[PDB]
Amino acid sequence: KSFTVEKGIYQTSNFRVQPTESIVRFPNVTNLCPFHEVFNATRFASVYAWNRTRISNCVADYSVLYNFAPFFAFKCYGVSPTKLNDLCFTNVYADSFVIKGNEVSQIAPGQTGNIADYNYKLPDDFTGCVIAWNSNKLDSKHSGNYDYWYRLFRKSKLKPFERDISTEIYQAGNKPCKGKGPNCYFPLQSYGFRPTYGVGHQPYRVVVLSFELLHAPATVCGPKKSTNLVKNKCVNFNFNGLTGTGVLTKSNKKFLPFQQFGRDIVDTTDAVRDPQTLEILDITPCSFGGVSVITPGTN
Amino acid sequence: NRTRISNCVADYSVLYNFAPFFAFKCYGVSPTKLNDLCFTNVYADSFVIK
Amino acid sequence: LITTTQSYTNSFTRGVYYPDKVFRSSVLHLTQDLFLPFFSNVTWFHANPVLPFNDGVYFASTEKSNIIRGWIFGTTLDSKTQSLLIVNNATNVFIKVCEFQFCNDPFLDVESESGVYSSANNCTFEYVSQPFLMKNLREFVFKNIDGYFKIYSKHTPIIGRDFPQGFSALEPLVDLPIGINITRFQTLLALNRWTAGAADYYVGYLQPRTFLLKYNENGTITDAVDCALDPLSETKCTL
Amino acid sequence: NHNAQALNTLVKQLSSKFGAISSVLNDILSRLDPPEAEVQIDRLITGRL
Ligand SMILES: *[C@@H]1O[C@H](CO)[C@@H](O)[C@H](O)[C@H]1NC(C)=O
Numbered sequence: 319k320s321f322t323v324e325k326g327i328y329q330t331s332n333f334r335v336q337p338t339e340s341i342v343r344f345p346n347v348t349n350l351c352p353f354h355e356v357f358n359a360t361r362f363a364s365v366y367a368w369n370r371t372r373i374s375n376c377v378a379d380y381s382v383l384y385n386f387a388p389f390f391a392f393k394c395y396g397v398s399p400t401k402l403n404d405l406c407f408t409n410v411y412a413d414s415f416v417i418k419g420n421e422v423s424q425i426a427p428g429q430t431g432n433i434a435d436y437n438y439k440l441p442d443d444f445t446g447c448v449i450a451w452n453s454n455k456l457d458s459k460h461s462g463n464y465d466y467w468y469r470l471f472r473k474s475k476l477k478p479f480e481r482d483i484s485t486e487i488y489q490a491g492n493k494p495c496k497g498k499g500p501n502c503y504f505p506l507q508s509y510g511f512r513p514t515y516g517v518g519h520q521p522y523r524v525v526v527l528s529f530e531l532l533h534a535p536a537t538v539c540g541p542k543k544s545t546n547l548v549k550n551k552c553v554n555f556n557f558n559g560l561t562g563t564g565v566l567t568k569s570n571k572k573f574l575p576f577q578q579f580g581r582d583i584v585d586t587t588d589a590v591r592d593p594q595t596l597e598i599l600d601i602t603p604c605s606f607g608g609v610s611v612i613t614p615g616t617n
Numbered sequence: 618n619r620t621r622i623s624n625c626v627a628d629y630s631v632l633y634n635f636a637p638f639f640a641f642k643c644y645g646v647s648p649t650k651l652n653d654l655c656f657t658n659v660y661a662d663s664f665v666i667k
Numbered sequence: 668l669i670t671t672t673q674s675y676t677n678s679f680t681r682g683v684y685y686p687d688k689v690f691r692s693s694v695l696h697l698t699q700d701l702f703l704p705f706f707s708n709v710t711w712f713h714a715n716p717v718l719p720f721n722d723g724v725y726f727a728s729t730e731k732s733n734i735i736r737g738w739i740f741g742t743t744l745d746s747k748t749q750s751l752l753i754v755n756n757a758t759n760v761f762i763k764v765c766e767f768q769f770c771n772d773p774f775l776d777v778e779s780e781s782g783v784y785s786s787a788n789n790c791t792f793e794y795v796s797q798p799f800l801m802k803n804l805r806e807f808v809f810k811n812i813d814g815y816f817k818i819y820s821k822h823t824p825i826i827g828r829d830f831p832q833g834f835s836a837l838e839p840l841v842d843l844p845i846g847i848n849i850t851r852f853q854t855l856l857a858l859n860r861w862t863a864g865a866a867d868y869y870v871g872y873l874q875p876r877t878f879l880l881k882y883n884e885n886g887t888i889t890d891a892v893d894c895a896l897d898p899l900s901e902t903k904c905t906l
Numbered sequence: 907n908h909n910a911q912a913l914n915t916l917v918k919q920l921s922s923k924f925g926a927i928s929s930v931l932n933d934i935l936s937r938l939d940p941p942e943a944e945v946q947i948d949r950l951i952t953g954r955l
Pocket residue numbers: 354357358382386
């Protein structure tokens with residue numbers, strides 16, 4: 319911060335070697351995930367008995383949802399939706415059911431209510447997405463359709479991620495029921511859906527997608543195309559969602575047939591295995607350092 | 618309407634058997650732990666709205 | 668026709684498995700997980716009883732001529748809950764989470780399944796692979812955590828009769844996303860036909876513990892220290 | 907010995923979370939939108955400072 323400099327040596331900035339290109343190395347899978355099959359099933363189970371499906375070992379495309387329907391509610395919590403198309407996951411859990419239109423607000427972590435406490439409960443650390451779209455046209459009857467039921471009573475609360483199917487008479491009085499008349503009710507009540515019903519009471523189809531990370535090597539990701547492999551150059555690399563920048567070289571490490579990564583004392587990644595061709599690659603950071611300027615006086 | 622409650626034993630199961638409340642929100646205290654706390658006095662305000 | 672005799676014995680230093688899939692070389696690592704404590708008290712069965720599952724199970728056997736074949740897991744194990752079923756035969760291994768109507772005294776006819784269960788039921792998951800059971804000591808660790816059933820195995824040559832005094836690390840064998848609750852388990856035996864036979868195995872239970880593991884130049888675990896056994900081990904783990 | 911110990915502690919301090927979802931900035935940036943990433947980045951900044 320001066321226009322004149324005295325004689326000496328000064329440390330000014332830092333230098334770093336820039337990357338040249340980008341490398342993407344995904345495993346070769348062409349199988350498509352049954353997202354379409356899970357949808358448009360022409361029959362969804364009730365809220366008190368919600369359908370659960372496991373999705374793994376396929377290529378996940380989320381444009382099918384985009385062309386599916388104009389969803390009334392589409393909320394993602396742990397991940398931004400727009401970035402869903404380039405992530406890798408271990409496995410996916412899809413839970414499908416049908417509820418009332420106005421009950422969609424109750425489907426969220428840290429939420430209370432009739433449905434949120436008696437039919438479905440989400441964990442506090444939920445990582446996934448929730449989709450809710452209207453189904454008045456397909457799940458309504460002129461006389462009234464009662465195929466869908468919801469639970470109204472329970473002895474205690476519900477933990478996240480469990481399903482209750484036991485059917486019994488709920489007790490409200492002190493004396494044991496052994497009957498129906500005196501202060502004893504039925505927790506399950508049938509939904510009443512009619513076309514003349516307005517918005518907020520027509521049936522709405524709800525699908526909850528649950529992901530997880532920090533697990534076995536990822537399986538559900540194939541929406542992006544792979545590239546070639548280069549060595550001895552500063553490059554950006556992406557192996558099954560593990561991203562970084564550096565130089566990849568041949569490695570002489572005796573990996574046992576079940577490891578994938580490799581760490582050191584400081585606990586940072588230094589070796590990797592190529593998914594498509596089983597081979598050990600050493601990773602080294604690109605060159606960086608300080609810059610000093612040597613000058614006599616400006617006089 | 619405002620009422621003051623003090624010098625008694627407070628049981629919150631009567632509310633549970635009362636009715637299936639549409640809204641039941643507690644701010645400074647978790648509801649489940651209301652059954653083992655001690656308070657100085659209670660103020661109950663009752664009315665009817667839309 | 669079946670006789671089961673119980674005894675108690677020492678576990679020494681056995682039942683150590685690889686915690687994760689990370690390669691490490693020439694390093695000492697502190698880990699916290701469900702382990703079998705050193706010099707513990709294991710049960711010796713000699714030849715079925717139904718045993719608890721708790722949090723995890725360590726199983727060891729040394730029988731010959733393939734007397735022992737598979738295990739069954741469950742919580743009620745009769746008609747109301749899907750139950751695991753691992754079956755090992757000459758060519759392959761079956762794994763079924765199907766709901767079985769188990770017999771009062773399940774066993775293998777050797778080869779109809781009517782001796783185990785009357786019929787299957789509404790079930791989805793199934794798996795098949797190369798047989799697990801490949802003078803020889805076979806060690807297994809089973810544990811069920813957060814929607815995952817994990818099995819580690821190890822095969823060793825033995826010349827003695829009791830637990831060998833040595834160290835062996837159990838490499839991972841299989842991981843399955845089953846997602847059920849397991850509380851009890853039982854062993855499955857095969858009887859030629861009703862001829863009387865004999866077998867022997869050892870059972871232990873896992874507990875949460877902190878260990879110090881040693882990785883050599885090649886990424887193999889060669890020694891470990893149990894940090895809560897005695898003051899010297901605590902000092903070793905501190906340093 | 908003291909110099910090596912201090913340097914090792916400083917390097918090892920980089921794998922802590924300081925009450926965030928992850929200790930890696932790359933995945934935080936690759937799985938979150940800008941309005942929500944800074945709420946996690948600032949905690950790492952404070953801890954490392
Ligand atoms: C689902 O099924 C309906 C009717 O069978 C069909 O019109 C539609 O194309 C299918 N696929 C999707 C993505 O909706």
